[PDB]
Structures are given as C-alpha cells and as structure tokens.
C-alpha cells in the first residue's frame, strides 16, 4: 500500500494567474488544491486600484470550476503615483490582502512601478500604520550588477535600510534564492518572512545550463549555484516557521519560453505540491511539510488555518508534456517526468 | 568612411558541420579567411586519417570557385586512439593538430577523452612530432558549478599536463576567464589561446537579463563581466600568443530554441567586424591585424597569408536568418546594426 501524506489544505502565498484565456486555463490547477492564494498584480496594465482588483477577483472567481473552494487574495502593485488612500481603502474593504513591491527603476513610468523606495515612503508608512504586509521581489536591477548578485545586493542596499526605517512593517521576502537571504530571514524578527518556490529547492543553475539551456527552468530571481540551493533546503528542513509555500507559478505560452528571448517563469502550479513533498522527504523533514504548506503562511498573515484536508500518495505518475491554451500550449514544471508524490 | 586594411585573416577554431549545414556555412568562412582549423566533433567524430581526408573533400566540394580557402584538419582524440593513426595523419599533411574534448563537456563530446592518463602515449607522440594540442579546458564532474569548470581545469588538468610534457605545444581554446587569461599571459612560448567574438563582446548578463537568449548560449559558458573585461584587456595589450578563433558553431534555429537548446554561436558571418569593434573600443586597432593574421601562423609555424582585405566603418544590418533546406540558421547579432563590415 502506497504511503499517504495527509495535510490541512494548503494555500499558495505567491501566484501568477494572468488574465483572459490564460487565466481560464491555469486557475483550475490552483483551485483544485489550494484554499487561498496570494494573487500577484503584475498584469498589463497592472492592478493598482481597488476597482481593478475587484474586477480581476471576479474574473478569477468566474474561472474556478464548480465546487472548488478557492479564494483569491488580491494585491496592489506598488507604484510612484499610487495614492496611499486608495491602498488603505482597498485594505479596509478586504480587497487588498497585501501590496507587492517590484524592483525600483528610475526609468519606469509612474503608472507602472517605483523609481525608488524613498519615492513611495508615504505609501509604505501607510501600510506600516494599518498593518498591511509588504511583499518584496528583492533584487536591484541596475545594469552594472551581475544577475546572480542582484538578490544579495538588495538585502544590503534596500531591505535592511527599509526595515530599519519602518520597524513595524510586516515583510515577506518573496521567492528567496540565496544563502544570503536564507540567513537574513533566519536571523530576522517576527515581522520578516519568506516564500520559497519548488524550483529553487529542487534545482540550481547547473540544471538550467549544463548539457543545454533549459528555458523552462529560466525564472527570476535566477537559479543560483548549488551552495544557495542547499541553504534553502536546510532552511525549510529546519522547521523554521517564517518560511512558507509560495509557488511563483508564472505561466508563459511555449512560444514565449522557447524563442530567441525566453520569458522568465515556471508554470509549476500543476506539480508544486508533490515537488515540495519530495524535497521535504529527501531532507528527512516530512514532519515540517504541513507547517510549510498550510500553517506558517496563515500565522504570518493573521489568517485562519484551513480546516479541510487533502492527501498526497507516494505513487509514481507521469506529468503531462503540455497543457493546451486556446492558441499555443503551456509546458508545465517537470513536463514528461515521473514524479514521486501526487494528490489523491 | 574609415577603412582598415589588414592581411587576410585565418580562423584558428571553426565548426563546419557536415551535409547541408556544411554547404550553407562554408562560404561565410571561405570568402574571408585564408585558412581555418576545422574541428573534428562530427557525429561520428573524425578519429582516422581516412575520415579526415573524406571530410576535407566534402568541405572543398562546398567551397565556391574564386575562394582561396584551405581547411586545416584536426583529429578528435579518444581514449583508445592509436598514436600511429594520429602520427600517420600528421606525416601525410592531413592532421594539422589534435583536439582534446573532455568526455561530456560539450557538443558531440560523449566519445571524448576521459582522462589525460588514458591518452599519454598519444600526447607523448604529439610532443615528439611537434603536433599542437588544442584543448577544450573544462572539467565535467557533476558536482562542479558550470561557471567554475574552466578555472578548475587549469589547476587540475592543464598545469599538470604542461609540467609533464614540457615541450608540448598547447592552444587553450576559447578562453572565457581572467584565470585563463592570466594563465596564458604568464605562460611560455609553447602556450597560446583563442578567444571568440562573443566572449569579448558580452558577459553572462547579456544572455540572462531581460530574457534568456539561447543564441548567446555556448560553451565555455559566458562568465562575469570581470572575466569579459580581462579578455578584452588581454587582446588589447598586443600579447602575441592570443589569436583569432571564432568557434563558429552553427545549429538549426529549432535546435537552439527548444526546451534544451544546443550550445554554440553561428558567428562566422559577423565575427571579423565584431573583433574590429572590440579592438577599436579598446583603443588597440594597431594590434588587430596581428590577432587576426600573424599570431596564429607564428604559433603554428605556418606562413602568413600574402593577400589583404579591407574593413570599412559603415553601419550594416545583420540578417535575421539564413535559409537551410529544411531549417533556418540565426546568425550571431541577427537583426543588429554592426559597425564594421568587410569591403
Ligand atoms: N562551444 C560551443 O558552444 N559549441 C561547439 C563546441 C565547442 O567548441 O565546445 C559546438 O561544436 O557546438
Ligand atoms: O519576477 C518574476 C515575474 C514572474 C512573471 O512572469 O510574472 N516570473 C518570474 O520568473 N519571476
Ligand atoms: Zn518576483
Ligand atoms: Zn512572482
Ligand atoms: Zn570547445
Ligand atoms: Zn569549438
């Protein structure tokens, strides 16, 4: 009899659902399994108002198959032009669960992002005041910074000063990828948390580059050398309770991945949970798997833990080679592979 | 307006492939370069005089009339290669050099050398006959991070080898690091290196920032900017045991843009003008001719070419693609404006 792993229903604390037809195709892979997900706001144009978040939420709810108990937790894209009163109203009305800060860029349009942390202090101070968590894509994107250095550079140049200035602000260091960040989070206080994706636990940059270039392992922040991979696995395996499940499922059509300029992102919603289960098992740390998927996130966000359960079975299954879109196809994370754990 | 006249260059590291691909790519080389080192990593690899002779004829068959191009053939070293096979090839004017591919390190390398110890009698015979050893210098242990494989090779394989065969002539091919640049810079007259246009022009950020760019994916992998800057400084310095090796390494577009893209830049169409740009940028055009047309021949003990070509500083558009019969081929710098073109 195949081994069963029963957990409280998990949630995904970092998700891209896109919009339109792509949203219709990808939502079921989340809603079948997760109770809630943090839905990121990086649409074109981005979600920067309460009204757009409300409409987007409904588009998401329209696409949930009948009987799935799924609640999207919406976010606001932080920008220079964002009125702090719009952010607050959204939070007060339960529309925005959190706000997301993408890397600063002096050339970014004020409707589309942030020029500097200084420029958005009024808004960050308002989040601190009302207790809205800030989710951070923590990389500095200056042209003279080597891509593999960008996360470490952010800790020093942005994250520490920010947290030193806003001492009551709750911050999730999203999809951490380095020992620098794993140590930083491990040594932080109760106001600092992190998500980790399945790909940053399972692979390192050799898997993306040795024996060929694999654009389906291409994502941001970039896969790092093996020492960083190991630090991430050790962190989740330690039982540390301020790291939790965030897939960063980030779907692009195959034509946009397998081109002269491949888009960043892994479509891992279909296979993420089993992948995490495999990682915890390999680390002899299955006793901490539930907390990571189903408890740590809710505790940090001040939300209740789910009260229904799901089961994973240790029985080999093949992952689909691709998933049809209206036009084109999506190639899922671990496409065509035999995986060790699957949902029953 | 500015015209730069140089002795006709050679290419000391080239992949011409075979069949249709060969017929398509040879003219981009044969129209410009007097000679090329034609690497031996066909499938199956060129490991006998007979295969090299036939391959050479396939190449000559594809050279347009009017082009004065000579392919310099190489032997693909394997663990079980008879040193007599290699020596007969050298004696008959077939093999100019032999190429060491560490097993599984690169394109068509599964049949490659598993250790130096396995091929010592072959290397001792090369040392004795004066045949140069061309080296793809990377270790392959699964445990070693890809960006470290060139540096680790210097320490663990190259230095011991050269200490053991003190008269063996070695080209450290397509070097990519400061480690290799300093190593070559500080070596003796029996050590040289080639550098590609892409390792001079770009670093790993150009392949990975803003998207993943498979047409810049090649081996040894593009390194940090500090390494790129060291390579530029080396060629700019006028150091004379570095020379032109494009490592033009074509693959069909579909093979490049797949879920597992092949390693190699098709740079033959644009390499020479690209080198010119790098040399101009480094304020070192006085050293350009020697890199392209003199340093390689000196190291190999061959005469310099006796004809001349001109580069002009007129901005030109690189083609988006080049047709194959049942495929396309994307050139290095496809769709870019390039500063120098061959007149
Ligand atoms: N360098 C590459 O990226 N590719 C070359 C092989 C080689 O020079 O190692 C090829 O033949 O495809
Ligand atoms: O920062 C990001 C954005 C995401 C996306 O495609 O939306 N993809 C990634 O790889 N990481
Ligand atoms: Zn992100
Ligand atoms: Zn994301
Ligand atoms: Zn090579
Ligand atoms: Zn080569």
Curated annotation (Swiss-Prot), chain A:
One of its GO terms (molecular function) is zinc ion binding. The active site is at residue 248. The keyword Metal-binding applies. Its EC number is 3.5.2.3. It comes from the Bacteria. Catalyzes the reversible cyclization of carbamoyl aspartate to dihydroorotate. NCBIfam families: pyrC_dimer (TIGR00856). Homodimer. This is Dihydroorotase.
